[PDB]
């Protein structure tokens, strides 16, 4: 509703300004407005959407963890639990908003492999965040929703993108984190990270200097996780 009266181009322009100003809540609201205009997003626009929401939820997740840790150490009255709950609900709300944009209608209109993989990666990531705070049975269906999104993205990426494609690499990095941190599957995590690294290494020779820089940055983050996990 709220951005309904602003031009799509103005929303994108303002999202970029908000990024420069480190006003990520505003950035996210601008990009939501832009998505709700109903047109497909370009590559640059998808990146703006992703940056905005990653910063918003990243703050929320960091606060949630601080509060959860205090709550665990308490096990005073109801305040820590209440405030943890408040932050958790706000986080769930942001995740639901993102998931709702993906479902209405970014994924369904995404035909090119790069756009489709991008959005399905996002869908996995935001179900993963919901999983981090979920408890019990809804927890299982949330975890399976994340897994299903990542798996669909992986299947498309393997068929349609080079092993060095940054989106493909990032997806593999995040799905490997899903396996290690959420699914209790450290061996799958390690396998995925190693195979992804090795297949990218083998394709580096095909890259220009600028593409090489991007691919190798992500490869280093895969290696960093492998180091931590072994």
């Amino acid at each position: 509703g709220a951005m309904g009266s602003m031009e799509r181009a103005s929303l994108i322009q303002k999202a970029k300004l908000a990024e420069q100003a480190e006003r990520y809540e505003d950035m996210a609201a601008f990009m939501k407005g832009a998505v709700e205009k109903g047109e497909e997003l370009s590559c640059e626009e998808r990146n703006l959407l992703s940056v905005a929401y990653k910063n918003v939820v990243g703050g929320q997740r960091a606060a949630w963890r601080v509060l959860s840790s205090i709550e665990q150490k308490s096990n005073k009255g109801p305040e820590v639990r209440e405030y943890r709950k408040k932050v958790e609900t706000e986080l769930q709300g942001v995740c639901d908003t993102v998931l709702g944009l993906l479902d209405s209608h970014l994924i369904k209109e995404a035909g090119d492999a790069e756009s489709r993989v991008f959005y399905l990666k996002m869908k996995g990531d935001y179900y993963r965040y919901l999983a981090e705070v979920a408890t019990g049975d809804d927890k299982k269906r949330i975890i399976d929703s994340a897994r299903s999104a990542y798996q669909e993205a992986m299947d498309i990426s393997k068929k349609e993108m080079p092993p060095t494609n940054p989106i493909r690499l990032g997806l593999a990095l995040n799905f490997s984190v899903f396996h290690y941190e959420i699914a209790n599957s450290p061996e799958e995590a390690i396998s995925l990270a190693k195979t992804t690294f090795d297949e990218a290494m083998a394709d580096l020779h095909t890259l220009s200097e600028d593409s090489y820089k991007d691919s190798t940055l992500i490869m280093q983050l895969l290696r960093d996780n492998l180091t931590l996990w072994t």
Binding site: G170, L173, N174, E181, D224
Partner: peptide, 8 residues
């Protein structure tokens, strides 16, 4: 927790 992808 393990690091996931940062922003570009």
């Amino acid at each position: 927790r393990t690091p996931s992808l940062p922003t570009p």
